[PDB]
Amino acid sequence: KNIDGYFKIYSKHTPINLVRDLPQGFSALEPLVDLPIGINITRFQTLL
Amino acid sequence: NSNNLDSKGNYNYLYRLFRKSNLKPFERDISTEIYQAGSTPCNGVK
């Protein structure tokens, strides 16, 4: 998430076992870090 | 006042006199393109 140049990150890790579908279980991610990024992001690419 | 600090004469202080849209809160814009105040596309034309 991003607001007024303040980019926020949330995350969660859980043991699971499914092939292609997301798990039916319910879980809430928790806030991780906030930085004044100062860029109104409109594009992104995951790096491998 | 910074006359004793910034006034040499000094002209290295600039401000954007023309922009096609107003800036949002705490927004910045360092665009260098020639302002197209008319329908004529000023793509390098002055």
End-to-end CA distance of chain B: 36
Q: How many CB atoms lie within 10 A of CB B1?
A: 6
Going by their DSSP bridges, the two strands A30-36 and A6-11 should be labelled as: antiparallel
**Residue in chain A nearest B25 by alpha carbon:** A4
- Angstrom distance (rounded) from CA B46 to CA B44: 6
Q: Does A21 touch chain B (CB under 8 A)?
A: no
Q: Which residues is A10 bridged to in the sheet?
A: A31
Token pair for A36: 């004044």
- Give resolution in angstroms: 3.8
Handedness of CA A35, A40, A42, A48 (dihedral sign): negative
Residues of B with Cβ-Cβ distance to A37 under 8 angstroms: none
Q: Give the method of determination.
A: cryo-EM
In sequence order, which residues have a C-beta less than 8 Å from that of residue B21 and are 6 or more positions away? none
Three-class DSSP category at A30? strand
Q: Which two tokens stand for residue A45?
A: 């690419």
